């Protein structure tokens, strides 16, 4: 009676890695795919200053994303209770010879 319940991915592929960075006091970093369902992202605060081509010495906002693709997946499905099926075999002696084993 097998109804699929939930599937897990155990091997994946990554593609289209990109990052967007912001100087301090210029707000939050932004990528157009950061709100995409198929993309995985992470925001962080990096050190920025004159070495990085920025006017002030402070914590800059950095977001990076990439597209996630599942390569191989496993599936957990439902066992409907009260929906089993046993199979039994019965064999009778006397007339039979062991070719019937």
């Amino acid at each position: 009676n097998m109804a699929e319940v939930r599937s897990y991915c155990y091997e994946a592929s990554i593609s289209d890695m990109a990052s967007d960075s912001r100087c301090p006091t210029q707000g939050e970093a932004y990528l157009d795919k950061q709100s995409d369902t198929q993309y995985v992202c992470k925001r962080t605060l990096v050190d920025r200053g004159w070495g990085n081509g920025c006017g002030l010495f402070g914590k800059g906002s950095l977001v990076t994303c990439a597209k996630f693709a599942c390569s191989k997946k496993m599936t957990g499905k439902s066992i409907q209770p009260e929906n089993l099926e046993y199979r039994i075999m019965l064999s009778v002696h006397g007339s039979q010879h062991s070719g019937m084993i």
Partner: antibody, heavy 120, light 115 residues
Framework: VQLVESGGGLVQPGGSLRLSCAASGFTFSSDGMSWVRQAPGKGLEWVSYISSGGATTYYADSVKGRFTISRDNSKNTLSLQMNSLRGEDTAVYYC??????????????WGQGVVVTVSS | SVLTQPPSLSASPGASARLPCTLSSDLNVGTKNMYWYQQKPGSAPRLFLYYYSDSDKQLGPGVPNRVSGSKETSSNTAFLLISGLQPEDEADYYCQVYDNSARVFGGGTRLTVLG
């Protein structure tokens, strides 16, 4: 999908106008909306955005502090309050669906716009 | 953030139209959602094409298959493509990007189908 604007006309510098747009053909309360202006003979420039629920509003630097965008999701109406109007604000004002989708945005549908003329 | 388009372009019917939109080094074209809007004289703009890549795109309602998009990272440019040009395709076209509450429009290209 129907976007019908109204509430425009001739205003004088330092006055105020209040634009209204009735929306139909879609679930209005589930989409963000934006106003876009186009001066006579020139290109397009975004004015202001408001989210579906109204919690978040954004304004262009040329309009900040002077304009205010509003929603009435029960009446399916988008409002744009314009204060301290100057001669730069003379343009056609378009009402547009500013949607949010999985990894996708955009001005899907536009109204035909209303004329706003600021002159002394 | 500046979007740069040529003021005007022209071609004959049956042509493969190619309309550029230069992104300033502020952003990078490869990571941008591209929204093209078509506006014919006397009418409002309509959403013509959404384009992130050849695998992430959508044509506007009633926009034929001949309309396509592309990018080139070397020149930080986006392109609007119209195969087999037709008189009805003569219009004004604007590229547009989103950037953290900022909606930036290009100058706009006025496409002219020659007749």
């Amino acid at each position: 999908v129907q976007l019908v604007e109204s509430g425009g006309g001739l205003v004088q510098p330092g006055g105020s106008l209040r634009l209204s747009c009735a929306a139909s053909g879609f679930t209005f309360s589930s989409d963000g909306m934006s106003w876009v202006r186009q001066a006579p003979g020139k290109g397009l420039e975004w004015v202001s955005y408001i989210s579906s629920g109204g919690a978040t509003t954004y304004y262009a630097d040329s309009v900040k502090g002077r304009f205010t965008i509003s929603r009435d999701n029960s009446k399916n109406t988008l409002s744009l309050q314009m204060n301290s109007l100057r001669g730069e604000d003379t343009a056609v004002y378009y009402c547009a669906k500013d949607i949010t989708a999985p990894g996708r945005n955009g001005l899907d549908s536009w109204g035909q716009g209303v004329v706003v003329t600021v002159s002394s | 953030s500046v979007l740069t388009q040529p003021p005007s372009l022209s071609a004959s019917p049956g042509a493969s139209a190619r309309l550029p939109c230069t992104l300033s080094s502020d952003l990078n074209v490869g990571t941008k959602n591209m929204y093209w809007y078509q506006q014919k004289p006397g009418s409002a703009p309509r959403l013509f094409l959404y384009y992130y890549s050849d695998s992430d795109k959508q044509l506007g309602p009633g926009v034929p298959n001949r309309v396509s998009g592309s990018k080139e990272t070397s020149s930080n440019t986006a392109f609007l493509l119209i195969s087999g040009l037709q008189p009805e395709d003569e219009a004004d076209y604007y590229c547009q990007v989103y950037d953290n509450s900022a909606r930036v429009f290009g100058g706009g290209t006025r496409l002219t189908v020659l007749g």
